[PDB]
């Protein structure tokens, strides 16, 4: 009847109630976790930026010091050639006289 | 009265109706503009993004052959530094010989 109706209408309503307590406490965790990951994520998200920034600019340093560097060995190589040349025209006068007196 | 009245609020009813008519096309139109202008900063944000991996990975390759340059130019410093001693070394010995024949 309308009284059993009732009865077990409202019976299923608590119930009902209660369930969504639950989910109430099963999302706000939910959340609580997602917060966390977000926040990790995004920490994560903001150094790795950075560290890349670090990279290329210590990537032109670098190439720009080796390219000074490889400058000044051009020009070691360019003064040893000059002196390989002397010591040729050097030992040339040497033997030049060493010639002479044989 | 309430003929005066009716009157007077249709009339307004349709200056608003094609205020909304006109709110609709220039909306519409501006909508239009910001369509474009989206589509344009994307189109040119995906370009520089290239750009730069590009400038990024020829960095690296630029970096790589300076220092198979400069390795090279070193060897190059150390061969002739070893001609440069024999030169002297080989100049000593004519002026052994020089000096013995005077």
Known sequence: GS?????RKNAEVTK?????????????????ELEDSLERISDQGQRKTQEQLEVLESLKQELATSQRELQVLQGSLETSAQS????????????KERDSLV
């Open 3 to 7: 009284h059993a109706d009732l009865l």
């Open 16 to 32: 009902q109630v209660s369930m969504a307590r639950q989910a109430q406490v099963d999302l706000e965790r939910e959340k609580k």
């Open 84 to 95: 390989e040349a002397n010591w040729a025209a050097e030992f040339a006068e040497l033997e």
